């Protein structure tokens, strides 16, 4: 059960108004054939079009949610819109563009779909709620065959070129007219009543319907985010690695110990309460705290509301010493808390848009995480950037300019001068921070914390 059965059912009811009279019984090979693609008893790596919801959460990276709207069809104008906010119209002679034809419209779609995905992922899904207009425009701009490698490169095709009779992958494909071997879902098969926006709408308040293509085209693949990450949601898949996770990952650990470190030494906090993980390990195992541990799973629809985390009758006393919320999304953080959260707002090769302001971040694997609120923070304020270190100074052991900071809180920089060593260390930790900071990660800590409280650590 690899891929999708050609021989598999095809539920047409959703297809009808724009194609009368099509069958209700239907498969995916007189479907693709209907669609004017031939697949001829290839055994060549692409045995279907269409790919399994499994397949499509797997390959969640290539999604781009596509719409059709007729504007009068082979007579009529079609605006095709993409979840990118783009709406082409093609003449058969929320950016948008005039009437042009076909032959420069295909060169348009793989320009935007190169761009979007190059550093996202190895293929496109077409992600549709089909209604006819979506999969009949597809021989205009899609070729098939078999699984191919890109002219420059290692990496499987993506696009074709009818000039030079060539194929690329999406770096290579400047000048390329086709999109090559592309993939597609339509969420309608998964069981739906009633039309994509009254679906949409139960879920989600950030996206709305300008009754253009590509408003539908991202009303779409919300959708099909909501039912695979939001509603539905799997631990279990590993994403492959496209950029800078393991750095970013690695910079996390060392912010925490730092940060929760520094928190327990300036306010020797008796008990801390770590909220969230229910795999966590102590990030500062020396420290003399009473480290108390309470299970929360990421939240991936609403961020949990701390009246539910806290309240229903554990130390009991929250109120008590520290409250740690290592990306535990939570309403309203306590006044005694050490905060990350991450900010859905920056979108990046690693954050993709999700549903009702949300985001997908996915690093090794898929956590939808609710919008980003502000007002969450309220009774704390922003953690100030600093490094802390007890550590003795000795070098062991790439050159040297003099440190200079008032935010490197060490023996040396208390005694006047910065050792290499901790100029290393410094410069080193002020890399991975930036790193996180970048990545979409806030912190936040209680506003009595005062790295003035460290100095006295060196007595
Ligand atoms: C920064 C940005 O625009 N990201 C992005 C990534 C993937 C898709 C799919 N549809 N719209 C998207 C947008
Ligand atoms: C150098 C150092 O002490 N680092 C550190 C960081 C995080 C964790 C978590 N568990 N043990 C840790 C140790
Ligand atoms: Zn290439
Ligand atoms: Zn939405
Ligand atoms: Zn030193």
Not at 175 to 189: K, S
Request: charged letters at 20%; aromatic letters at 14%; hydrophobic letters at 40%.
């Amino acid at each position: 059960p690899t891929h999708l059965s050609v021989d598999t059912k095809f539920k047409t009811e959703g297809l009808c108004v724009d194609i009368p009279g099509i069958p209700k019984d239907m498969t995916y090979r007189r479907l693709i054939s209907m669609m004017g693609f031939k697949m001829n008893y290839q055994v060549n790596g692409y045995p279907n079009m269409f790919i399994t919801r499994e397949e499509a959460i797997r390959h969640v990276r290539a999604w781009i949610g596509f719409d059709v709207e007729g504007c009068h069809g082979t007579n009529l104008p079609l605006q095709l819109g993409f979840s990118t906010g783009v709406n082409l119209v093609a003449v058969p002679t929320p950016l948008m563009y005039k009437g042009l034809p076909w032959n420069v419209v295909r060169i348009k779609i793989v320009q935007m779909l190169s761009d979007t995905l190059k550093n996202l992922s190895d293929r496109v899904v077409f992600v549709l709620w089909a209604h006819g207009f979506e999969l009949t425009s597809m021989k205009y701009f899609v070729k098939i065959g078999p699984e191919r490698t890109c002219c420059l490169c290692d990496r499987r095709a993506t696009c074709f070129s009818t000039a030079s009779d060539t194929y690329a992958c999406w770096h290579h494909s400047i000048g390329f007219d086709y999109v090559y071997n592309p993939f597609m879902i339509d969420v309608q098969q998964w069981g739906f009543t009633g039309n994509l926006q009254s679906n949409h709408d139960l879920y989600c308040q950030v996206h709305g319907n300008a009754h253009v293509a590509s408003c539908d085209a991202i009303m779409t693949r919300c959708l099909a985010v909501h039912e695979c990450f939001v509603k539905r949601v799997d631990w279990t898949i590993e994403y492959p690695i496209i950029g800078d996770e393991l750095k970013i990952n690695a910079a996390c650990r060392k912010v925490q110990h730092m940060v929760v470190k520094a928190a327990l030494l300036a306010d020797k906090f008796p008990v801390l309460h770590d909220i969230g993980n229910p795999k966590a390990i102590k990030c500062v195992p020396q420290a003399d705290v009473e480290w108390k541990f309470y299970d929360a799973q990421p939240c991936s629809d609403k961020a949990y509301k701390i009246e539910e985390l806290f309240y229903s009758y554990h130390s009991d006393k929250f109120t008590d010493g520290v409250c740690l919320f290592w990306n535990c999304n939570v309403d309203r953080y306590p006044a005694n808390s050490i905060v990350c959260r991450f900010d859905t707002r920056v979108l990046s090769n690693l954050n993709l848009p999700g549903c009702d302001g949300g985001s997908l971040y996915v690093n090794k694997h898929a956590f939808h995480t609710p919008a980003f609120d502000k007002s969450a923070f309220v009774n704390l304020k922003q953690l100030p950037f600093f490094y802390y270190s007890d550590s003795p100074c000795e070098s062991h052991g790439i050159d040297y300019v003099p440190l200079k900071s008032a935010t490197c809180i060490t023996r040396c920089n208390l005694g006047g001068a910065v050792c290499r060593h901790h100029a290393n260390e410094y410069r080193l930790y002020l890399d991975a921070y930036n790193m996180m900071i970048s990545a979409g990660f806030s912190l936040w800590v209680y506003k009595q914390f005062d790295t003035y409280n460290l100095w006295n650590t060196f007595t």
